[PDB]
Amino acid sequence: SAVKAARYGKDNVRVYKVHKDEKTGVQTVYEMTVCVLLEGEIETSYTKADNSVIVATDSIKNTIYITAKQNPVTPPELFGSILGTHFIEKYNHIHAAHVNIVCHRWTRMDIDGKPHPHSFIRDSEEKRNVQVDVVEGKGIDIKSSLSGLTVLKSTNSQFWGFLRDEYTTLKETWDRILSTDVDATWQWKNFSGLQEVRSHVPKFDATWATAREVTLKTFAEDNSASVQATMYKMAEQILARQQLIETVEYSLPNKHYFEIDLSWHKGLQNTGKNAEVFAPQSDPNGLIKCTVGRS
Amino acid sequence: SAVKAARYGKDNVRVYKVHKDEKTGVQTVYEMTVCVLLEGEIETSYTKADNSVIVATDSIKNTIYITAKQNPVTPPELFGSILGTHFIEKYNHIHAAHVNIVCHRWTRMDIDGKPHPHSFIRDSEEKRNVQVDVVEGKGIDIKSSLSGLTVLKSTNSQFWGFLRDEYTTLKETWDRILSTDVDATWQWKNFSGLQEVRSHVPKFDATWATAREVTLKTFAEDNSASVQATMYKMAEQILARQQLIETVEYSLPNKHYFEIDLSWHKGLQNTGKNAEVFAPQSDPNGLIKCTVGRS
Amino acid sequence: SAVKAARYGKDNVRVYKVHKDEKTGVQTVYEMTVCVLLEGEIETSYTKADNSVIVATDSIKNTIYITAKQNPVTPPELFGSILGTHFIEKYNHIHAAHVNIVCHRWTRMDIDGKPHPHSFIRDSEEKRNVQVDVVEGKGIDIKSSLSGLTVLKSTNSQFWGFLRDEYTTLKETWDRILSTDVDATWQWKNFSGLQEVRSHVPKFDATWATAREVTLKTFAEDNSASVQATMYKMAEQILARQQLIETVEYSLPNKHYFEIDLSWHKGLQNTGKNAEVFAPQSDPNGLIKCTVGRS
Amino acid sequence: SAVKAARYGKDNVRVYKVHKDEKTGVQTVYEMTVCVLLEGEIETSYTKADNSVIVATDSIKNTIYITAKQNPVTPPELFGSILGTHFIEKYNHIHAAHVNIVCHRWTRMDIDGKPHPHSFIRDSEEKRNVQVDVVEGKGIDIKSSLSGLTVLKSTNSQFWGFLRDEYTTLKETWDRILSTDVDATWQWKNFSGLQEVRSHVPKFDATWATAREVTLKTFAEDNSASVQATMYKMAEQILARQQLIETVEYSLPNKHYFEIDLSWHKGLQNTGKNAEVFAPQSDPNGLIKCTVGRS
Ligand SMILES: O=c1[nH]c(=O)c2nn[nH]c2[nH]1
Ligand SMILES: O=c1[nH]c(=O)c2nn[nH]c2[nH]1
Ligand SMILES: O=c1[nH]c(=O)c2nn[nH]c2[nH]1
Ligand SMILES: O=c1[nH]c(=O)c2nn[nH]c2[nH]1
């Protein structure tokens, strides 16, 4: 037998950082969960019980805190690239670092129509994520995403004209509820190293904001022919607005809300045009994915 | 042996309702999870296998949908009171209904600075809840709550002057992070029946909004001496603003963020005045409760 | 305004203890999650920012570890009683301690038909719990429970003869699936103090084992007329086998498995006597409770 | 823009099947959660709102139930292969099916030392899984796994001799607790089609049992030099016992249990040789992966 692939590291490292403006008194907080996995010339730890090649996962944890102390933690694309580069440069035998960051929302509170200097609210479990792969001699690959963005529209969604055969019971519809949890990932062109990532720093927050805005507007305004068709429109627009993105991937559940026929009870009308009360279905759910790239 | 207490019913009944304004085109959605448990002269179903006394839990489910079709579902205090009253009036042998409602957020989207007519976002997992106990001959008891409101302040929290003995290692502090998930419940004076609940309908949404506003403002502005002291201030203010409330209860975790001493690494300073990077602790957590009533 | 009730303490304190037999080499592990909440003359911490009355929750955490070091942690009824008594005796102004313990399963592994001396498996998320209320001058109240015991029977469950009215769609049945998650609590007679709890130590594990055995056997063997009827049989038997128990409470979800009519597809028969494939329902669920005491 | 990849289908489809032996009266239950995603000539549903190419996800759900009615559901490798083959054969324009199955435990109850004919218990949340990829013209690729197997050993684990630099605080140890949740996947050689999968049916359950037994025995008996070294031993043995497996992958968290220094309290000794009470850490955790193949 032989080791074909190996990676190891520390997962679920929770980190909080505060920035304090001494001039204005304003404080800004960041909170993340970080995972770092390393690869390189480490086979002997598996095959020969040779621990000399192991950077302890505990040390990886310490390194995350030290790096956060000495560097900006935002945008997360930059912090991830700094952290990954550290490992491949510091250790001769480590040749790849894989850094995953989940950013948690701490939104500044408005109290009496004024932004508060040091108080924050978690407005939704929506996350902003990065995956950064730093590979020695091959640069830095960054995938940025948003996830956990949960939306619903109560009309202006249709689904008709699908394949009908002996397995089909679904009725065609011209008016249904559409609800999903959005997972959207944009993959950046490969960067040569940290200097190049630094050169593009302003594009990271701007592209996240664009991806979010395009997703929300398209969902709200499209008279949707299917999840497939609406999601493609979203992806097309993001690619048009940021030339440094190579691909956009969406993964969308279709969270079903069923009509409830109440006609058995005193002829109560609650279907089609008369539908007011629906039963949200926890499971099963449709799952629709697509990756869109350039011609 | 004897049956000392019994209740039974249906839990986790998900309900969605849409309201459509034909004049303006504007749609408004409501989504809830409902639980209804009944009590009354039902001992024989347990002791003698006498099912004749059982209103099937499946029928309770049907009743929830029918009631939602024929009545407003907002404010939830009213809907809960309608639903509970139905069971005690319809069935001679049922003498109490216990209705729990969890309301999920569907907040209207703003697209280009304008409210969208039929598109919604789940902004946070904060819930608005009601517990309604309808007891034949004893009226209607309503507890209203908000839960899952997660906040953090990065300064203006202190904790010093506590008891120190041979079990104590905690250092006194004049500047710490304070973060909690707010669970706040206000208990209404007993109502004689549905007519009285209906007479107070406007107070329910207004009191929820007040409870939320008082909680956020007090948390943000108090130079907190402890969770105990800040929470009492919140409760006192709610009782002052709504005379129909008898008690206010808060249950608050203290979600700890620990300093990380980095001095072992090149004398890096990250404690006290120099603290920037902290480690959020998943567990354990402080838990602080209080119920405040009138003199 | 006035403080009507208050309690505070530490929740989610994870504890592991190992016992090592030097003679045999055999090791035994215990793992628990502990919550301790205190009450007493502490109103001034809320109303006057008087921290002098506060035993810090951090100190409560330390006390749990110290107590576990110096005392047996099994049975949990005993450990809980020791821990609660400590607080009311040590602090003059603390008059009640409320101790909740959840015990996690670590079952010794069998390797080649022999019990292994130091290796363990988590066989199910079933828990054994205690709630211990130690109140100065009023003794020790103990509720013991098992929870998270998930069972299913594929036949020998019936449900017919229930109330039928204009809200009823449920068909009577003489053969259905019955599945539940068992939550069963037995409440001990009040104990005068620690000496009395110690005198009954052997009864705690034996009564837990009896409660579990009675639950499983009755579920498996009863040709069930309803959840109500089967659960009563369980409770009656536990009360008969342990005279020091005052009441037994069961709380049981009815986790529904629905028939799937496939007759629309080539006349495939999958209902009634021909039912083979079913759809487990995540929600809603029946919820049936009962508390059984002595005549 | 262009569609680079697309797949869509139904997730979270819960299925239960019962088998009834008329001769012996014995019943056996199976419960699974199934996901099926399809690929093929479906780009136009995304780009042109052409639904004619869409097999509705609702129809995919129906197909899962029908297939379960007409075929054995065990071993899951076979059921998955049947289900995936159905889609690629039935629909000319569908060229790949991806089937994920999670099997839930329903273990027959022993009542008074005898196996019960129709009563079952969920003994642990350990799962047996399959991933089956059926690709037109390229055969059937099957990955089988077990997950959620949670174990702990209280001694006979060591970790010393790792890299020490200015980022390292971890002390070397010759005696520690080792606890993990096992995720182990074995990848079968490619099968040419359903006939070949059928020819190997007995190997699927036997290889699952072997993988489980090897994992448990190796964990219990190895005087572990690291997670890396012990996991490699497991993988090597599985590959030796089943020639039709090409690779074995393990993914293992290192769930840390920390010593608690109690010496500040009356010189209480609870570290090193004297350690009895430990603090389980919820996060962070080590994460160690390896894929082992043949020379
Ligand atoms: O078994 C271990 N492997 C590792 O890589 C490691 N790093 N810290 N502790 C560890 N334990
Ligand atoms: O056992 C049952 N008890 C009930 O009260 C009930 N209601 N519907 N189905 C039921 N099954
Ligand atoms: O606000 C606090 N209240 C308390 O009771 C406490 N105990 N430790 N830290 C604390 N912080
Ligand atoms: O938008 C949809 N896309 C689909 O593929 C589908 N299948 N059923 N309902 C559906 N809705």
Ligand code: NA
């Ligand atoms: Na390197």
Ligand code: NA
């Ligand atoms: Na009545």
Ligand code: NA
């Ligand atoms: Na006392």
Ligand code: NA
């Ligand atoms: Na095909």
Ligand SMILES: [Xe]
């Ligand atoms: Xe951070």
Ligand SMILES: [Xe]
């Ligand atoms: Xe969508």
Ligand SMILES: [Xe]
């Ligand atoms: Xe609703």
Ligand SMILES: [Xe]
């Ligand atoms: Xe607070």
Ligand SMILES: [Xe]
């Ligand atoms: Xe313990």
Ligand SMILES: [Xe]
């Ligand atoms: Xe039951």
Ligand SMILES: [Xe]
């Ligand atoms: Xe199944």
Ligand SMILES: [Xe]
């Ligand atoms: Xe391991």
